Amino acid sequence: EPSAAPTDVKATSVSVSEILVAWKHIKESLGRPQGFEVGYWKDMEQEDTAETVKTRGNESFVILTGLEGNTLYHFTVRAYNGAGYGPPSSEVSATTKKA
């Protein structure tokens, strides 16, 4: 079971519909993930409406696509493996571009 959240989490605006989320891998002494789950939600909606994307393997970023334009998004990232989900990262935010 992953025991720690990823660190150095950053969200970066890419375009009207894309945001890059990147993080640092967890120390192996804290567990070995099958991947990470990124939860994301629009600011004007609850965290309980969050959509999720899973990565698989050891890449420490994902470019989220199909996002609403000119919109503040919030993100958290957590590791996962067969035994379950690890704790979530600090929340980060970025806004998709305008017009």
UniProtKB/Swiss-Prot annotation:
Localization of this protein: Cell membrane
Expression across tissues: Expressed in brain and kidney and at very low level in placenta. Not expressed in other tissues. In brain, it is highly expressed in the occipital lobe, amygdala, cerebral cortex, frontal lobe, thalamus and temporal lobe. Expressed at moderate level in the cerebellum, substantia nigra, putamen, medulla and hippocampus. Weakly expressed in the spinal cord and caudate nucleus. Weakly or not expressed in the corpus callosum.
Residues carrying covalently attached carbohydrate according to the record: N58
Domain Fibronectin type-III: 5-98
Domain of life of the native organism: Eukaryota
Family: Belongs to the immunoglobulin superfamily. Contactin family.
Function statement: Contactins mediate cell surface interactions during nervous system development. Has some neurite outgrowth-promoting activity in the cerebral cortical neurons but not in hippocampal neurons. Probably involved in neuronal activity in the auditory system.
Subunit architecture: Interacts with PTPRG.
Protein name: Contactin-5
Protein source organism: Homo sapiens (Human)
Parent-protein start and end of this portion: 874 to 971 of 1100
